[PDB]
Write a protein that binds this ligand. Structure first.
Ligand SMILES: Nc1nc2c(ncn2[C@@H]2O[C@H](COP(=O)(O)OP(=O)(O)O)[C@@H](O)[C@H]2O)c(=O)[nH]1
Lengths: 340, 58, 328
């Protein structure tokens, strides 16, 4: 029958398309980024778009504008909360009202950065009490880009403000679904995946990631002096390391290559001058105020786990495009060598 | 606030009419019995009535 | 929360006052179904990665399947002809659905979006609003679809406007599955709070809550007359719940099956309850007597999904092994 014949042909045309897509799929490598919040996952993805993708046009940059406003509000809300938590007093009486104004901002509905809010932000930021709180950020959770944005508040508040590439690299992009960023490099499609935004039960989706090509685990080197009071004063690095161990021991990641990025090496250089590693890891036998000894120690500690599996480790600064260019060139070679 | 909300929810769940399990069970059994003949997975049909065995398709 | 104890107790005592006999007691005299021995009649080849979901069309002939290969495939089961292949924006798919009309399908997953595709093939609506993964969706008609989510909510959507008409709140854990009543007035959901909930679609209220012994419910399905439903859980157990008697009637389990259940469906008469298991098999249970009647062993990885046609003539299994099989 003519209609039957045409349905057969349609099916075979679909089979052709699925074969073609299958050929392409075999030229895709999935790189699953893992690591605790603020470790550098989203920044790394943005660097891949700068280095190997379409980058950020002026129109792209405009799409991030309200998110920069939102980062300022979130950062100041965190400090306002910490003034209460840590019982630090504000110097300036108006700052009770300024803090209340900022505390009540609905961050998700922010689309503008109007003058009374900018003024409140700046007046809070210069309050010596808020500066004390900022100096004690080791004791709570504050974005590592808070100071950056608050320092540049005037630029950000100026009529016509257009985010810089640095602004884009540092801004929090809110999502509670999966992040996938694919890019082409040497006839391979790298599919970068980040599940860090998801807030649901991992047990119900971790098997979506059986046998990914590579796991890229990020740890913030600069968290060495922070503890989890609720977890019997577990060092934050120890918690990151425990998560890492769960990952490298997971039965369906045994075929995955494991890349470890010890990130925020710049912030370690800053912090090590005044916050001593031996106070948090007394086994540390290197000199004080020495970033190189600190990061070497942290690397060794991180991979001291109890498999003949190689862990491919790199120190990084994910906000430094040149650094990520250099490190990812070596990583790409590891991944391609293993998979071809 | 959320407690008041749960109390109202529980009020709503409690104030329903329930039947005997004996009756609920009888009703399920009767449904099965009334539709047994129409169930091809329970009572397999002739090969000539099975589209997945008819040569005209595959 | 003294009042909330007095009510929780009132519900328990009321249910006990109805428990005058058990289903198994009532069904003890009826004949067993005997050995159910279905054979593989079709093998549907074309997906290139795990299949996560499938749904039959109402013509008991076409079906849609969804895979991590990033495709929906619509198949003519009778011929095995492929009728459509739809490339997805997000390959992280967990559910698909066939509209009763045959004119649309839907799917979604870790993108937290329920995407609608017009078969008469481009994406025609992206329904955004869930804040966690889309676990299940079912069309009421071409204009409305109900969803369940990892965000602990279900929702009814107006497809034209893209808005949630009704949000169904009450679960305290990820919702994994839903099933519409035969007449579409009610639906049930099953969640990681180990509860199943009955909802009024149009009022948007939870009418009744059922507990599944503190194990996640991964799958749920109405009994054909709409007065009962079944669940499948991580604890290797299926369970039957009656709406009017407001309580569990039966469990289906063997001590030597310990793996999770992914999927459940009744046969057309309701006499058989079919369930898909992590151990790569489908087990067929006597819904009335609780005996295992038969097994479908045709896959090399988890059975992730299953469906029985509206005409009752076949069961489909879908699997992590990349294949669907049609059985009877
Ligand atoms: N100074 C500095 N900032 C960094 C570095 N890596 C990430 N950041 C910033 O720290 C914040 C948290 O990093 P992000 O990439 O969002 O982490 P994620 O939560 O894992 O996605 C952002 O503002 C980043 O731009 C780094 O090596 N040095």
């Amino acid at each position: 029958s003519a209609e039957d014949k045409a349905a057969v042909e349609r099916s075979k045309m679909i089979d052709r398309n699925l074969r073609e897509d299958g050929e392409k799929a075999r030229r895709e490598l999935k790189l699953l980024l893992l690591g605790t919040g603020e470790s550098g996952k989203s920044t790394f993805i943005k660097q891949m778009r700068i280095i190997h993708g379409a980058g950020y046009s002026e129109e792209d940059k405009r799409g991030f504008t309200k998110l920069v406003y939102q980062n300022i509000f979130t950062a100041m809300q965190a400090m306002i909360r910490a003034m209460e938590t840590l019982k630090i007093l504000y110097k300036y009486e108006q700052n009770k009202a300024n803090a209340l104004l900022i505390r009540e901002v609905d961050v998700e509905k922010v689309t503008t950065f109007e003058h009374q809010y900018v003024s409140a932000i700046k007046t809070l930021w210069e309050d010596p009490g808020i500066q004390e709180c900022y100096d004690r950020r080791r004791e709570y959770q504050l974005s590592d880009s808070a100071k950056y944005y608050l320092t540049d508040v005037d630029r950000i508040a100026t009529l016509g403000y257009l985010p810089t590439q640095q602004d884009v690299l540092r801004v929090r992009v809110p999502t509670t679904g999966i992040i996938e960023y694919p890019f082409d490099l040497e006839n391979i499609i790298f599919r970068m995946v980040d599940v860090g935004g998801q807030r649901s039960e991992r047990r119900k989706w971790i098997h979506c990631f059986e046998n990914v090509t590579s796991i890229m685990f990020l740890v913030a080197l600069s968290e060495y002096d922070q503890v989890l009071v609720e977890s019997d004063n577990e060092n934050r690095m120890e918690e990151s390391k425990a998560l890492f161990r769960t990952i490298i021991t997971y039965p369906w990641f045994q075929n995955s290559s494991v890349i470890l990025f010890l990130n925020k090496k710049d912030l370690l250089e800053d912090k090590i001058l005044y916050s001593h590693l031996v106070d948090y890891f007394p086994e540390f036998d290197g000199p004080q105020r020495d970033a190189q000894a600190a990061r070497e120690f942290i690397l060794k500690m991180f991979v001291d786990l109890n498999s003949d599996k190689i862990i491919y480790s790199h120190f990084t600064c994910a906000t430094d495009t040149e650094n990520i260019r250099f490190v990812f060139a070596a990583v790409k070679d590891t991944i391609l060598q293993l998979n071809l | 606030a959320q407690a008041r909300k749960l109390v109202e929810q529980l009020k709503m769940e409690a104030n329903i009419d329930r039947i005997k399990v004996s009756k609920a069970a009888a009703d399920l059994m009767a449904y099965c019995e009334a539709h047994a003949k129409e169930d091809p997975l329970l009572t397999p049909v002739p090969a000539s009535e099975n589209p997945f065995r008819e040569k005209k398709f595959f | 929360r003294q009042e909330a104890e007095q009510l929780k107790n009132q519900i328990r005592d009321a249910r006990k006052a109805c428990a005058d006999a058990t289903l198994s007691q009532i069904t003890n005299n009826i004949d067993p179904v005997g050995r159910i021995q279905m054979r593989t009649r079709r093998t549907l080849r074309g997906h290139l990665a795990k299949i996560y979901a499938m749904h039959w069309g109402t013509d008991s002939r076409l079906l849609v399947s969804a895979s991590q290969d990033g495709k929906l495939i619509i198949w003519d089961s009778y011929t095995t002809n492929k009728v459509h292949a739809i490339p997805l924006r997000s390959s992280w798919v967990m559910t698909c659905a066939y509209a009763p009309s045959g004119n649309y399908v839907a799917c979604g997953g870790l993108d937290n979006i329920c995407s609608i595709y017009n078969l008469k093939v481009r994406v025609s609506r992206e329904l955004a609003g869930h804040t966690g993964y889309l676990s299940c969706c079912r069309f009421l008609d071409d204009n409305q679809i109900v969803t369940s989510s990892g965000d602990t909510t279900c929702a009814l959507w107006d497809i034209e406007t893209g808005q949630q008409t009704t949000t169904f709140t009450g679960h305290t854990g990820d919702v994994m599955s839903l099933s519409l009543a035969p007449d579409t007035r009610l639906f049930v959901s099953g969640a990681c709070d180990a509860s199943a909930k009955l909802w009024d679609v149009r009022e948007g209220m939870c009418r009744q809550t059922f507990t599944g012994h503190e194990s996640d419910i991964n799958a749920i399905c109405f009994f054909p007359n709409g007065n009962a439903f079944a669940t499948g859980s991580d604890d290797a157990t299926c369970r039957l719940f009656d709406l009017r008697a407001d309580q569990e009637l039966m469990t289906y389990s063997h001590d030597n099956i310990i793996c999770g259940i992914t999927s459940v469906s009744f046969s057309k008469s309701g006499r058989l309850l079919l369930a898909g298991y992590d151990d790569f098999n489908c087990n067929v249970w006597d819904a009335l007597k609780a005996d295992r009647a038969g097994v479908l062993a045709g896959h090399d990885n988890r059975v992730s999904c299953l469906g029985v046609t509206d005409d009752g003539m076949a069961v489909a299994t879908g699997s992590w092994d990349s294949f669907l099989k049609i059985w009877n």
